[PDB]
Amino acid sequence: RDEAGITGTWYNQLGSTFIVTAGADGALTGTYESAVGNAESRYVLTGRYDSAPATDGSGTALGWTVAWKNNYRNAHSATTWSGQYVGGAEARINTQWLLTSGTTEANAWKSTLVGHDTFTKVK
Amino acid sequence: RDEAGITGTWYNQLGSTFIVTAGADGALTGTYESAVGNAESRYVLTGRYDSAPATDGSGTALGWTVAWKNNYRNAHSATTWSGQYVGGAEARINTQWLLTSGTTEANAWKSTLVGHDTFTKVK
Amino acid sequence: RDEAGITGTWYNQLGSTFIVTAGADGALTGTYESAVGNAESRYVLTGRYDSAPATDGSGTALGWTVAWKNNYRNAHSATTWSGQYVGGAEARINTQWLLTSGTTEANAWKSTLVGHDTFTKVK
Amino acid sequence: RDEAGITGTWYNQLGSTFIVTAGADGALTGTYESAVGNAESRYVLTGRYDSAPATDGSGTALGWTVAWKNNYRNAHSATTWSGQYVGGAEARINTQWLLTSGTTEANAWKSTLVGHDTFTKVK
Ligand SMILES: [Cu+2]
Ligand SMILES: [Cu+2]
Ligand SMILES: [Cu+2]
Ligand SMILES: [Cu+2]
């Protein structure tokens, strides 16, 4: 268990800030603030992580969601990040994400962006 | 708001079952049971949805996570689904997902599966 | 070998038309015409397929690319489809695709769409 | 046009080697050698690029395919890379890829890996 390793404040290559608490039972709760896009201030996030990972050197699988509505803005979209926590001197969360926008059915083909974010504890 | 449209039991093309409650504030909570893979019985899920969607005919953006640990099994992996709810006689949730396994750093290149699930209220 | 099974005209769920020739050596060459997006008329495609698939009932892995420039339009983008051919009465090509647009480095995070197309020999 | 900027030998973060020729007309032809996976020696690749990119500082969209069959091995799979070329002192190709394996229909849900490769002209 990486409850203590995951809990805290993380930053990605875009300058976004992810603040998370890891529960003993697998929960992830916190706030996300994007440095880019149709976003301002903090948004709620929730997710899950493997609270009993393999002990063979593998990372810890996890994921979370942000719906891009808060008191300031509504971007009618949601991002999910799916990835793994890798602990140690230079801890990281390595993720791939899917960002779906609400669309009409005629536009659904162009609804979903894909990308990759790497989070560190410094910067 | 689609709190009432989303809340309930959904089934995908693989025969998996998704049971969700939508909160007024954007939360999604419930259980997932996969018909395939290294899985048995129910697993916790959490996620978020846009609680004030566009009124122009667009769908409602949402996402959720399952970490594949429960009292029965641990598949050292997490799936995130990112998609949209489309209401009406034949309501659907149309998703794309990312399934990340915990790996060593040598294996990280092969850590993540991608696919697509369509959920309906019947079958 | 599925050289004869793959070669010919295919249609997807959007009404796009894919015309391909499969070479003995693994090549795929042809034209694509999209029913959606910043596209008109035919565009060049090239790709590769497994010319000696497994004989255990598995599908035949393949992929191809279209750059969205022709004599009519330039959408400064490219799509790659990665998938498998499944032969038999109701033959199909089942794909997932990635559509990357040229962007500035500030915009690179929003450069790439993801989706899924299923091609059949009728419709 | 980036025919001269793209043509040549590129290396990714895994130590794989991509050797490509860019044609005046949008073609990409060459060989790929993976440092990882069920692969040995060189494999054929083909693809396409935007031969008349935007002049506003944007990158050049491109993609290519490798089917993992050569005279040595057959991994019954294909990878497609979709991305953009960014020119200048530290030129790069920034990609996302989809790796589909031939599967039975029961296994199709687990057929496709997703990841991201960054190619440079040194290392
Ligand atoms: Cu206010
Ligand atoms: Cu028990
Ligand atoms: Cu003309
Ligand atoms: Cu030999």
- Pair A22, A1: CB distance under 8 Å: no
**What is the DSSP-derived secondary structure letter of residue C55?**
S
Total structural domains within chain B: 1
Selecting from A14, A37, A112 the residue whose C-beta is nearest the C-beta of C113 gives: A112
- Dist. CA D102 → ligand 3 center (Å): 41
Extract the tokens encoding B119: 């959920």
Q: If we measure between CA atoms, which residue out of A21, A26, A80 comes closest to residue B76? A: A26
Extract the tokens encoding D8: 């040549």
Taking residue A23's Cβ as centre, other Cβ atoms within 10 Å add up to 13
Q: What are phi and psi of B109, to 5 degrees?
A: -55, -30
H or E segment and range at residue A18: strand A17-22
* A88 Cβ contact list (under 8 Å, min separation 6): none
- Pair C83, C63: CB distance under 8 Å: yes
Q: Strand locations in A51-111, DSSP E? A: 60-69, 74-86, 92-101
* B106 Cβ contact list (under 8 Å, min separation 6): none
Nearest chain D residue to C54 by CA: give it. D76
Nearest chain A residue to D98 by CA: give it. A114
* Alpha-carbon torsion (C50, C51, C54, C57), positive or negative: positive
Cα separation values, D98 from A74, B21, C80, D15, Å: 31, 33, 9, 18
- Pair A85, A93: CB distance under 8 Å: yes
CA-to-CA distance for C19 and C30, rounded, in angstroms?
Answer: 5
Cα C90 from chain centroid (whole Å): 18
Residues in chain C: 123
The C-alpha angle with vertex D23 and arms to D18 and D27, in degrees rounded to 5, equals 70
CA-to-CA distance for B80 and A85, rounded, in angstroms?
Answer: 15
- Single-letter residue type at C123: K
D81 is in an annotated binding site: yes
CATH number of domain containing B119? 2.40.128.30
For residue D14, is it left (φ>0), alpha (ψ between -120 and 50) or beta? alpha
Q: Which residues constitute the domain of residue A88?
A: 1-123
Query: What b/e readout covers A58-95, taking b as 16+ CB neighbours within 10 angstroms?
Result: bbbbbbbbbbbbbeeebbbbbbbbbbbbbeeeebbbbb
Q: Strand locations in chain B, DSSP E? A: 8-11, 17-22, 27-33, 43-49, 60-69, 74-86, 92-101, 112-120
H or E segment and range at residue C96: strand C92-101
CA-to-CA distance for D122 and C34, rounded, in angstroms?
Answer: 38
State the nearest Cα–Cα gap between B14 and chain A, in angstroms: 21
Provide, as residue numbers in chain A, all residues whose Cβ is less than 8 Å from the Cβ of C36.
Answer: 109-110
- Pair B122, B11: CB distance under 8 Å: yes
Extract the tokens encoding A103: 């669309």
Do A76 and B69 lie within an 8 Å CB cutoff? no
Experimental technique for the deposited model = X-ray
